[PDB]
Amino acid sequence: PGPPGGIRIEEIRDTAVALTWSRGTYTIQSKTFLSEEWKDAKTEPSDIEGNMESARVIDLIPWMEYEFRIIATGTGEPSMPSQRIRTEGAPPNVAPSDVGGGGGSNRELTITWMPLSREYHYGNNFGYIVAFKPFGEKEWRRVTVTNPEIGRYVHKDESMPPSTQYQVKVKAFNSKGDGPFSLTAVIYSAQDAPTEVPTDVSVKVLSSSEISVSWHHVTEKSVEGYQIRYWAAHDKEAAAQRVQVSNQEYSTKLENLKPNTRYHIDVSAFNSAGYGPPSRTIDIITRK
């Protein structure tokens, strides 16, 4: 039949809205950002006679934006959408997924989780509360994160020993209340960066474009490799080139250097928490 006329919004709850409309020369569909497609909607009454100009759409998502249109019968053109409305909010009903963490620089405890999509926000002023305690303790430390779009918190505590075992978890929340906590993950705090320096560093000019850099290994168990910085005289130190080798290398050959050119050379130790102090700078000239 004909497309039903305009739509009037009668009531808005968190999971349902009441509707009334004008006659068309019924069935209801809804729409959100989830799809440009319209979804057939459930109602009260479950079935709508042509007799009635009103109905109530149900099982809507809290704090979601909705449009609605009406269809008459047989199976004529759908109506123009109603004005876009937003359902009332409720406490979030899903916990954050993919919870873990680890690493970071000295004295950090980095905690991570997958952020809930807008779809799950369920209310105004959405956020996350992060909870964590040293393994086997009584009390949790809570911190609030007002960033619905970030899945990371970094806790800083100078007292924290390196690789301290921790119990951690995350829940969502909005102005209406708290969502369910996530699974409890076991993460370790950041390890300390190496503090010692590569000793006995030497550089052997091999050619017009190559030098060999050698050094003595440090003894810290945590060290994972060594970084060799090299920059020329006419360069800023912070614009240096770099090479990284495993902790099982005592030397490395640097290629593609410019001929007859003064080069500064560096060696430092590193692990997952960053770089230790570099060796005293050694200068050389490449061959002509």
**CATH number of the domain to which 72 belongs:** 2.60.40.10
Sheet holding 27-31, edge to edge: 39-40, 27-31, 65-71, 85-86
Q: How far is CA 125 from CA 12, 64, 74, 186, in A?
A: 19, 14, 45, 29
Q: Is residue 1 part of a domain?
A: no
Given 87, 121, 156, the domain boundary residue is: 87
| Of 109, 209, 235, 119, residue with least CA distance to 162 | 109
Q: Looking at the structure, do residues 181 and 103 belong to the same domain, yes or no?
A: yes
| Of 97, 173, 94, 182, residue with least CA distance to 131 | 182
Q: Cα–Cα distance between 151 and 131 in angstroms, integer?
A: 14
Q: Phi/psi at 182 (nearest 5 deg)?
A: -80, 180
Question: How many domains does the chain divide into?
Answer: 3
Asked whether the beta carbons of 205 and 211 are under 8 A apart, the reply is yes
Q: Looking at the structure, do residues 35 and 110 belong to the same domain, yes or no?
A: no
Q: Cα–Cα distance between 45 and 225 in angstroms, integer?
A: 70
Asked whether the beta carbons of 96 and 171 are under 8 A apart, the reply is yes
Q: Cα–Cα distance between 138 and 65 in angstroms, integer?
A: 42
Q: Cα–Cα distance between 36 and 21 in angstroms, integer?
A: 23
Q: Cα–Cα distance between 120 and 143 in angstroms, integer?
A: 21
DSSP 121: -
| Of 33, 5, 1, 2, residue with least CA distance to 19 | 5
| Helix count and strand count (H, E) for the chain | 0, 25
| Of 111, 63, 110, residue with least CA distance to 90 | 63
- Resolution in angstroms comes to 2.5
Q: Cα–Cα distance between 145 and 201 in angstroms, integer?
A: 46
Q: Looking at the structure, do residues 168 and 210 belong to the same domain, yes or no?
A: no
Alpha-carbon dihedral 12, 16, 21, 23, rounded to 10 degrees? -170
Given 87, 112, 128, the domain boundary residue is: 87
Q: Is residue 245 part of a domain?
A: yes
Q: Take residue 267 and report the two structure tokens written for it.
A: 């060696």
Residue 149: exposure state from Cβ atoms within 10 A (0-12, 13-18, ≥19): exposed
Q: Cα–Cα distance between 41 and 13 in angstroms, integer?
A: 16
Q: Is residue 177 part of a domain?
A: yes
Q: Is residue 104 part of a domain?
A: yes
Q: Is residue 194 part of a domain?
A: no
Helix, coil or strand: residue 147: coil
Q: Is residue 50 part of a domain?
A: yes
Given 164, 189, 214, the domain boundary residue is: 189
DSSP string, 28-52: EEEE-TT-SS-EE--EESSS--TT-
Rg over CA atoms, the chain: 32
Residue 108: exposure state from Cβ atoms within 10 A (0-12, 13-18, ≥19): middle
Q: Phi/psi at 269 (nearest 5 deg)?
A: -95, 155
Q: Is residue 128 part of a domain?
A: yes
DSSP string, 201-217: EEEEE-SSS-EEEEEEP
DSSP 119: G
Cβ neighbours of 249 (radius 10 Å): 14
Helix, coil or strand: residue 239: helix
Q: Looking at the structure, do residues 175 and 207 belong to the same domain, yes or no?
A: no
Q: Cα–Cα distance between 100 and 170 in angstroms, integer?
A: 10
Alpha-carbon dihedral 275, 281, 285, 286, rounded to 10 degrees? -20
Q: Is residue 92 part of a domain?
A: no
Asked whether the beta carbons of 208 and 180 are under 8 A apart, the reply is no
Give residue 203's identity as a one-letter amino acid code: V
| Of 209, 206, 203, 140, residue with least CA distance to 170 | 140
Which residues 6+ apart lie within 8 Å of 164 measured at CB? 109, 134, 188, 189
Q: Looking at the structure, do residues 14 and 68 belong to the same domain, yes or no?
A: yes
Q: Looking at the structure, do residues 180 and 204 belong to the same domain, yes or no?
A: no
Q: Looking at the structure, do residues 210 and 237 belong to the same domain, yes or no?
A: yes
Domain that holds residue 230: 199-286
Q: Looking at the structure, do residues 173 and 210 belong to the same domain, yes or no?
A: no
Helix, coil or strand: residue 120: helix
Q: Cα–Cα distance between 189 and 161 in angstroms, integer?
A: 8
Q: Phi/psi at 251 (nearest 5 deg)?
A: -155, 165
